Design an enzyme around this catalytic site. Structure first.
Site, PDB file in Angstrom:
ATOM      1  N   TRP B 280       0.855  -1.161   0.000  1.00 56.26           N
ATOM      2  CA  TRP B 280       0.000   0.000   0.000  1.00 56.26           C
ATOM      3  C   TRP B 280       0.902   1.225   0.000  1.00 56.26           C
ATOM      4  O   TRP B 280       2.080   1.145   0.332  1.00 56.26           O
ATOM      5  CB  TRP B 280      -0.961  -0.019   1.195  1.00 56.26           C
ATOM      6  CG  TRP B 280      -0.284  -0.199   2.511  1.00 56.26           C
ATOM      7  CD1 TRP B 280       0.383   0.755   3.217  1.00 56.26           C
ATOM      8  CD2 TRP B 280      -0.209  -1.404   3.288  1.00 56.26           C
ATOM      9  NE1 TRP B 280       0.870   0.220   4.395  1.00 56.26           N
ATOM     10  CE2 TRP B 280       0.519  -1.101   4.461  1.00 56.26           C
ATOM     11  CE3 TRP B 280      -0.681  -2.709   3.109  1.00 56.26           C
ATOM     12  CZ2 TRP B 280       0.786  -2.054   5.444  1.00 56.26           C
ATOM     13  CZ3 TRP B 280      -0.426  -3.652   4.089  1.00 56.26           C
ATOM     14  CH2 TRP B 280       0.304  -3.320   5.241  1.00 56.26           C
ATOM     15  N   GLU B 285       4.503   9.379  -1.786  1.00 59.74           N
ATOM     16  CA  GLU B 285       4.744   8.845  -3.126  1.00 59.74           C
ATOM     17  C   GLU B 285       3.774   9.450  -4.122  1.00 59.74           C
ATOM     18  O   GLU B 285       4.161   9.821  -5.235  1.00 59.74           O
ATOM     19  CB  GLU B 285       4.597   7.325  -3.140  1.00 59.74           C
ATOM     20  CG  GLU B 285       5.695   6.590  -2.432  1.00 59.74           C
ATOM     21  CD  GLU B 285       5.509   5.088  -2.503  1.00 59.74           C
ATOM     22  OE1 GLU B 285       5.895   4.488  -3.533  1.00 59.74           O
ATOM     23  OE2 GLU B 285       4.962   4.511  -1.539  1.00 59.74           O
TER      24      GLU B 285
HETATM   25  C1  HEM Z   1       3.481  -2.836   2.725  1.00 62.45           C
HETATM   26  C2  HEM Z   1       3.560  -1.521   2.482  1.00 62.45           C
HETATM   27  C3  HEM Z   1       4.758  -0.914   1.719  1.00 62.45           C
HETATM   28  C4  HEM Z   1       5.146   0.365   1.797  1.00 62.45           C
HETATM   29  C5  HEM Z   1       4.531   1.469   2.671  1.00 62.45           C
HETATM   30  C6  HEM Z   1       6.286   0.551   0.945  1.00 62.45           C
HETATM   31  C7  HEM Z   1       6.985   1.726   0.774  1.00 62.45           C
HETATM   32  C8  HEM Z   1       8.052   1.896  -0.088  1.00 62.45           C
HETATM   33  C9  HEM Z   1       8.635   3.161  -0.485  1.00 62.45           C
HETATM   34  C10 HEM Z   1       8.130   4.532   0.027  1.00 62.45           C
HETATM   35  C11 HEM Z   1       9.641   2.897  -1.336  1.00 62.45           C
HETATM   36  C12 HEM Z   1      10.580   3.901  -2.032  1.00 62.45           C
HETATM   37  C13 HEM Z   1       9.782   4.708  -3.044  1.00 62.45           C
HETATM   38  C14 HEM Z   1       9.660   6.097  -2.487  1.00 62.45           C
HETATM   39  O1  HEM Z   1      10.156   6.306  -1.351  1.00 62.45           O
HETATM   40  O2  HEM Z   1       9.073   6.987  -3.154  1.00 62.45           O
HETATM   41  C15 HEM Z   1       9.723   1.463  -1.494  1.00 62.45           C
HETATM   42  C16 HEM Z   1      10.624   0.777  -2.273  1.00 62.45           C
HETATM   43  C17 HEM Z   1      10.668  -0.595  -2.456  1.00 62.45           C
HETATM   44  N1  HEM Z   1       9.849  -1.545  -1.875  1.00 62.45           N
HETATM   45 FE1  HEM Z   1       8.516  -1.203  -0.419  1.00 62.45          FE
HETATM   46  N2  HEM Z   1       6.564  -0.658   0.336  1.00 62.45           N
HETATM   47  C18 HEM Z   1       5.629  -1.588   0.773  1.00 62.45           C
HETATM   48  C19 HEM Z   1       5.577  -2.908   0.361  1.00 62.45           C
HETATM   49  C20 HEM Z   1       6.555  -3.607  -0.328  1.00 62.45           C
HETATM   50  C21 HEM Z   1       6.526  -5.018  -0.654  1.00 62.45           C
HETATM   51  C22 HEM Z   1       5.354  -5.936  -0.292  1.00 62.45           C
HETATM   52  C23 HEM Z   1       7.643  -5.337  -1.329  1.00 62.45           C
HETATM   53  C24 HEM Z   1       8.103  -6.706  -1.892  1.00 62.45           C
HETATM   54  C25 HEM Z   1       7.668  -7.882  -1.438  1.00 62.45           C
HETATM   55  C26 HEM Z   1       8.434  -4.124  -1.422  1.00 62.45           C
HETATM   56  C27 HEM Z   1       9.658  -3.990  -2.018  1.00 62.45           C
HETATM   57  C28 HEM Z   1      10.232  -2.782  -2.355  1.00 62.45           C
HETATM   58  C29 HEM Z   1      11.338  -2.588  -3.269  1.00 62.45           C
HETATM   59  C30 HEM Z   1      12.106  -3.674  -4.054  1.00 62.45           C
HETATM   60  C31 HEM Z   1      11.594  -1.289  -3.318  1.00 62.45           C
HETATM   61  C32 HEM Z   1      12.682  -0.643  -4.192  1.00 62.45           C
HETATM   62  C33 HEM Z   1      11.975  -0.283  -5.496  1.00 62.45           C
HETATM   63  C34 HEM Z   1      12.972   0.197  -6.512  1.00 62.45           C
HETATM   64  O3  HEM Z   1      14.208   0.165  -6.217  1.00 62.45           O
HETATM   65  O4  HEM Z   1      12.497   0.606  -7.611  1.00 62.45           O
HETATM   66  N3  HEM Z   1       7.749  -3.104  -0.802  1.00 62.45           N
HETATM   67  N4  HEM Z   1       8.738   0.887  -0.724  1.00 62.45           N
HETATM   68  C1  LIG Z   2       5.202  -2.241  -3.192  1.00 71.09           C
HETATM   69  C2  LIG Z   2       5.541  -0.783  -3.121  1.00 71.09           C
HETATM   70  C3  LIG Z   2       4.916   0.038  -2.200  1.00 71.09           C
HETATM   71  C4  LIG Z   2       5.252   1.385  -2.171  1.00 71.09           C
HETATM   72  N1  LIG Z   2       4.649   2.212  -1.282  1.00 71.09           N
HETATM   73  N2  LIG Z   2       6.176   1.877  -3.024  1.00 71.09           N
HETATM   74  C5  LIG Z   2       6.803   1.103  -3.934  1.00 71.09           C
HETATM   75  C6  LIG Z   2       7.866   1.686  -4.854  1.00 71.09           C
HETATM   76  C7  LIG Z   2       7.362   2.368  -6.126  1.00 71.09           C
HETATM   77  C8  LIG Z   2       8.531   3.121  -6.742  1.00 71.09           C
HETATM   78  C9  LIG Z   2       8.932   4.340  -6.191  1.00 71.09           C
HETATM   79  C10 LIG Z   2      10.001   5.054  -6.729  1.00 71.09           C
HETATM   80  F1  LIG Z   2      10.383   6.228  -6.193  1.00 71.09           F
HETATM   81  C11 LIG Z   2      10.677   4.553  -7.831  1.00 71.09           C
HETATM   82  C12 LIG Z   2      10.289   3.340  -8.394  1.00 71.09           C
HETATM   83  C13 LIG Z   2      11.059   2.822  -9.594  1.00 71.09           C
HETATM   84  C14 LIG Z   2      12.492   3.343  -9.502  1.00 71.09           C
HETATM   85  C15 LIG Z   2      13.491   2.498 -10.284  1.00 71.09           C
HETATM   86  C16 LIG Z   2      13.959   3.251 -11.518  1.00 71.09           C
HETATM   87  C17 LIG Z   2      14.139   2.187 -12.588  1.00 71.09           C
HETATM   88  F2  LIG Z   2      13.680   2.634 -13.800  1.00 71.09           F
HETATM   89  C18 LIG Z   2      13.351   0.967 -12.122  1.00 71.09           C
HETATM   90  N3  LIG Z   2      12.859   1.253 -10.763  1.00 71.09           N
HETATM   91  C19 LIG Z   2       9.217   2.623  -7.853  1.00 71.09           C
HETATM   92  C20 LIG Z   2       6.496  -0.253  -3.984  1.00 71.09           C
HETATM   93 CL   LIG Z   3       4.065   5.114  -7.767  1.00 67.54          CL
END
Ligand code: HEM
Ligand SMILES: Cc1cc(N)nc(CCc2cc(F)cc(CC[C@@H]3C[C@H](F)CN3)c2)c1
Ligand SMILES: [Cl-]
Ligand code: HEM
Ligand SMILES: Cc1cc(N)nc(CCc2cc(F)cc(CC[C@@H]3C[C@H](F)CN3)c2)c1
Ligand SMILES: Cc1cc(N)nc(CCc2cc(F)cc(CC[C@@H]3C[C@H](F)CN3)c2)c1
Ligand SMILES: C[C@H](O)[C@H](O)[C@H]1CNc2nc(N)[nH]c(=O)c2N1
Ligand SMILES: [Cl-]
Ligand SMILES: [Cl-]
Ligand SMILES: [Gd]
Ligand SMILES: [Zn+2]
Ligand SMILES: [Zn+2]
Ligand SMILES: [Zn+2]
Lengths: 402, 404
Positions: B280, B285
């Site tokens: 969620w 974001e």
């Molecule tokens: C359950 C609630 C969740 C919240 C509130 C959340 C929140 C976030 C946020 C805020 C970011 C960075 C994007 C940003 O800060 O704008 C992030 C990145 C990430 N999340 Fe979580 N997330 C959740 C669930 C999950 C789940 C279920 C998974 C995998 C099973 C996951 C895996 C990742 C990964 C791999 C990234 C890095 C994405 C990237 O490098 O592009 N997240 N999440």
């Molecule tokens: C499950 C989930 C929950 C949440 N709450 N948030 C996210 C992350 C969404 C997200 C935020 C970012 F700020 C940037 C990306 C993608 C960044 C890099 C750049 C490359 F192109 C591939 N991914 C994705 C995931």
């Molecule tokens: Cl998004």
């Protein structure tokens, strides 16, 4: 094999070729990044010297000339006879500007070429030192129209102790321990406050008491000097549309002047070289007043703003913090004291980055410190990738002399 | 063992887990490259070494290391790879590896939930229409009429030779972005490319700025066919503000479910190029990144105009004020519609709790300061003043090339 550097807001790409010349080593390895940590003989002195001399002659478009080989020859000669050497005044000015230009956590670096350099390398005592410092503060303050400056006291040399300024900044507010176990004033200055007390200073009991200077002449205990009150320009904080804000009694000072850093120039070390500029509004509004471990006024303002402090989802913290920043900008402008907001500051840093890519092929920059502490992604440095590395000349941290 | 300090409290820990990191990142003693978005830059002997490491900690985390089935499971993988060159995960190991990969994700701020993850095993699927079913089940189970539940759907692993399951969309739910006659965009500029692909593979384009894209699902070896998400499976939230009544008239909305569908899941040396996960949203974001980034919807000046903010000068902090109200509107709207969302203060405090948990359990936690710190009000959260160590642990989510 130079890193590619992309701006994700605009799509631009650059390659940092300057980072290949990095003349020191940080804390990161391929195993683990430590970028977020706050704290990252006769022959090595010669190579730092030579490199700096080579630097100085490049910027005067005279590299590899007669004078260049001569000055290179003089320096090794003097390190042979004395073990150290002396900078010419023009080298010192150039070295001090390069140190600023090289500082990765300074978002103010668009200004690095307008730097007034005071040569106090002839300083003899703690009393002469004090006079130099009051002269720095007067020139830098300039009745509100602030000017960047640095005063260079004598270098580390064999035989003598160092000149040291014990204060972390020339202007700081006292922090007194309380009966509630708490701090009255500024909690970051509790230690230097206790050192001033045990060196004869008679403390106040207010929240914005300006600290005396503890000045250490070589091989002498630190001596205590009171800044004349007319020398420290202060700004009372009011809010343009929140009139009860002026009744919080808050003030800050005009002149940010870092006094505990070591300036390093071609192997020579200056343990006392205070430098001053002007504030970016978030340093005062966000860090100094709102950090829980500082003045910590954020809840008091939000409560006064009749915000809902029960739940975080009302964003009362973000709302209180923004008005505190607004109050700081309004106050400094009303008092005619130079101040830059974090939007103008970061927009000019981007101009600095483009100027630096064309001149040197890159620019050392610590993202965690360049991005402001509120509204980060609203500024153009957020979306800019940055490369952090240590060039010399530089300002380095150094241990506290006590 | 790196010293790690928190500068607001003063507390000190040591990160012993970092030393057990293997796949090296982009930094060197000469220069830090922590701010880069892409660090890593994208003889089966090495499959066995990653497989045995994964099985060992699987058996550590349940006390059953030394004697028992732990011995026996090591032999089965050996024989499986010696026989087939690859191996298959027990369903409990697959579940464990997906929770570890979430737990190891340095940029994820919401990892306090890492232990509560629904893992749908979609490995026995061999069709793009089948994929569409699994994706549609996931979306239904994740959305749950607004009471969101974390979930991942693991499609079949990359096998040596022969193609790859892939989802071409960056997320399961994305808005279109339509180029115009001046090179500007209607809709989401982040998705102008994938919108171009959907049009050239069959999609009739749409009205305006909040058209949900069709999926582009690729079964191995076959070209990606279009799939149209049923509108009742895509829960959206119209954005209103509690006291700025004109904000509803702006006509902004956002979807409920953030589901990333372009990352590669790596477990025990195996690779799953299609493994879409969801959770969620954190409120910033949507309000700060998607709505306010200049290269996104870029609504910030529009909101400031309607609030009659002094846009003549930056020192008025008009961008900061408008941004806070946009985040307030996102929070209010999601709560009114009863769609799970978390504000950046609640999330970062949950993360600090995660860090302490992880200190006692594993001797540290990999964290990427740049991404963990929220994009507004950074220093107002407890993570800003926390020093952090970034390193790569396995299992992991990794970036991968785009399938074109
Ligand atoms: C359950 C609630 C969740 C919240 C509130 C959340 C929140 C976030 C946020 C805020 C970011 C960075 C994007 C940003 O800060 O704008 C992030 C990145 C990430 N999340 Fe979580 N997330 C959740 C669930 C999950 C789940 C279920 C998974 C995998 C099973 C996951 C895996 C990742 C990964 C791999 C990234 C890095 C994405 C990237 O490098 O592009 N997240 N999440
Ligand atoms: C499950 C989930 C929950 C949440 N709450 N948030 C996210 C992350 C969404 C997200 C935020 C970012 F700020 C940037 C990306 C993608 C960044 C890099 C750049 C490359 F192109 C591939 N991914 C994705 C995931
Ligand atoms: Cl998004
Ligand atoms: C005149 C305008 C100046 C501005 C606007 C400015 C701004 C800043 C800011 C905002 C920071 C980091 C604090 C934060 O992130 O909030 C910083 C750090 C720093 N600045 Fe500048 N500065 C200025 C002048 C100078 C000068 C004249 C020098 C040296 C001659 C200098 C050297 C440094 C150094 C060494 C640091 C790092 C300090 C540390 O690591 O503790 N700055 N500056
Ligand atoms: C010349 C100048 C102008 C300006 N406008 N601003 C500054 C920066 C002042 C500043 C900001 C910080 F955020 C932190 C510090 C001191 C912290 C360091 C960390 C080490 F512990 C030693 N001191 C100083 C300097
Ligand atoms: C993780 C992190 C990131 C970031 N971007 N910023 C910080 C705060 C850095 C900071 C700023 C200050 F202004 C003062 C300090 C305390 C250092 C001095 C030295 C003495 F020990 C007394 N306190 C630290 C921490
Ligand atoms: C250049 C910079 O490192 C890059 O844009 C990162 C910074 N931090 C971020 N933090 C979050 N939450 N999301 C992002 O997209 C980014 N982008
Ligand atoms: Cl300060
Ligand atoms: Cl009260
Ligand atoms: Gd008022
Ligand atoms: Zn690093
Ligand atoms: Zn702070
Ligand atoms: Zn952004």
């Amino acid at each position: 094999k130079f890193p590619r550097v992309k701006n994700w807001e605009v799509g631009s790409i650059t390659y940092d070729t300057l980072s290949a010349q990095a003349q020191q080593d940080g804390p990161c390895t391929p195993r683990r990044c430590l970028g977020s940590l706050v704290f990252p003989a006769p022959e090595q002195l010669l190579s730092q010297a030579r490199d700096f001399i080579n630097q100085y002659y490049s910027s005067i478009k005279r590299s590899g000339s007669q004078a260049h080989e001569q000055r290179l020859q003089e320096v090794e000669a003097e390190v042979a006879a004395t073990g150290t050497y002396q900078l010419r005044e023009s080298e010192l000015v150039f070295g001090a500007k390069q140190a600023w230009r090289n500082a990765p956590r300074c978002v103010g670096r668009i200004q690095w070429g307008k730097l007034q350099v005071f040569d106090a390398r002839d300083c003899r005592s703690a009393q002469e030192m004090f006079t130099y410092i009051c002269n720095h503060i007067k020139y830098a303050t300039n009745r509100g129209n602030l000017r960047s400056a640095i005063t260079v006291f004598p270098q580390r040399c064999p035989g003598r102790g160092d000149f040291r300024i014990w204060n972390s900044q020339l202007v700081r507010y006292a922090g007194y321990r309380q009966q509630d176990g708490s701090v009255r004033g500024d909690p970051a200055n509790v230690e230097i406050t206790e050192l001033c007390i045990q060196h004869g200073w008679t403390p106040g009991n207010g929240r914005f008491d300006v600290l005396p200077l503890l000045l250490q002449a070589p091989d002498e205990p630190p001596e205590l000097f009171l800044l004349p009150p007319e020398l420290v320009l202060e700004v009372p904080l009011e809010h343009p549309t929140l009139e009860w804000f002026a009744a919080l009694g808050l003030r800050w000072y005009a002149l940010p002047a870092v006094s505990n850093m070591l300036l390093e120039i071609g192997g020579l070390e200056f343990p006392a070289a205070p430098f001053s500029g002007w504030y970016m509004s978030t340093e005062i509004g966000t860090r100094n007043l709102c950090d829980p471990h500082r003045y910590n006024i954020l809840e008091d303002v939000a409560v006064c703003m009749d915000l809902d402090t029960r739940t975080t989802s009302s964003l009362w913290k973000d709302k209180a913090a923004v008005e505190i920043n607004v109050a700081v900008l309004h106050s400094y402008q009303l008092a005619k004291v130079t101040i830059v907001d974090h939007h103008a500051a970061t927009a000019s840093f981007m101009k600095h980055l483009e100027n630096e890519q064309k001149a040197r092929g890159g620019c050392p920059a610590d993202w965690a410190w360049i991005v402001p502490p509120i509204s980060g992604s609203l500024t153009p440095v957020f979306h800019q990738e940055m490369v952090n590395y240590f060039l010399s000349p530089a300002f380095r941290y150094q241990p506290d002399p006590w």
